[PDB]
Amino acid sequence: TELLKPRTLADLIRILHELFAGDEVNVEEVQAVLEAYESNPAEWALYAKFDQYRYTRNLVDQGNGKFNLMILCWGEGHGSSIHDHTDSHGFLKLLQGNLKETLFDWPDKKSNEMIKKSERTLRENQCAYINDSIGLHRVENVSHTEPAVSLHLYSPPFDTCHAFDQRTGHKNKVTMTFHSKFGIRTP
């Protein structure tokens, strides 16, 4: 439980394997460690594989079963759907640029427009936390000029979740696909 500053991304990953050695999760400690890692672009350039038309998800580490660690690359104007996190912890650390995070309440069964509960601006090196009990969220790169890169950790890992229609609150099941794994493009 002695948390040291991650010197490198590699160091971060090693520390993460220690924090997730057990069955439970100290959320505040994982968040503090993620925040303490100073983004060094050279260290994660291998995973920063962008697509022109939407954001990409690039697997960095499989966390020996307990978590997925991955890097998301957001072109100018790229955003996600409103989604849940499948009963997992979600950690989001900015490695480059800014993201807008918008929070939504779980919809009632009546068809209604989903209204924003709040929004915030995540900035370089900041780490945010989300879970289903906090709410639904959307993540967007609203920048016209700057690509964004984020580091995402999910525990337990999941490759399916729901997307929500902002107009109705209706949900559909969605399968997450990896654009690359361990620096290897995986079509």
**Residue numbers belonging to the annotated binding site for Fe cation:** 83, 85, 137
Q: Please identify which residue in 10, 27, 45, 115 interacts with Na ion, judged by CB under 5 A.
A: 10
When the beta carbons of 22 and 123 are compared against Na ion, the nearer one is 123
Stretch that binds Na ion, among 22-30, 80-88, 109-117, 155-163 (CB under 5 A): 80-88
89 binds Na ion per the rule CB under 5 A: no
* Least CB distance to Na ion at residue 89 (A): 10
Q: Tell me whether the omega of the peptide bond preceding residue 156 falls within 30 degrees of 0, making it cis.
A: yes
When the beta carbons of 22 and 159 are compared against Na ion, the nearer one is 159
Q: Please identify which residue in 3, 25, 43, 174 interacts with Na ion, judged by CB under 5 A.
A: 43
Q: Which of 139, 150, 128 is nearest to 57 (CA)?
A: 150
Q: Which of 157, 155, 151, 161 is nearest to 24 (CA)?
A: 155
Strand order in the sheet with 56-61: 127-130, 89-96, 148-155, 68-74, 56-61, 180-181, 184-185
* Least CB distance to Na ion at residue 4 (A): 10
Instruction: Dig out the tokens for 116 from the structure.
Output: 């924003």
Q: Which of 16, 159, 31 is nearest to 85 (CA)?
A: 159
**Helix, strand, coil percentages, rounded to 5, for the chain:** 15, 35, 45
Distance CA 101, CA 122 (A): 7
Q: Which of 73, 39, 75 is nearest to 56 (CA)?
A: 73
When the beta carbons of 22 and 160 are compared against Na ion, the nearer one is 160
93 binds Na ion per the rule CB under 5 A: no
37 binds Na ion per the rule CB under 5 A: yes
* Least CB distance to Na ion at residue 8 (A): 3
Chain positions contacting Na ion, by CB under 5 A: 8-10, 37-38, 43, 47, 50-51, 54-58, 73, 75, 78, 84-85, 97-98, 100, 102, 132, 138, 140-141, 143, 146, 148, 179-180, 183
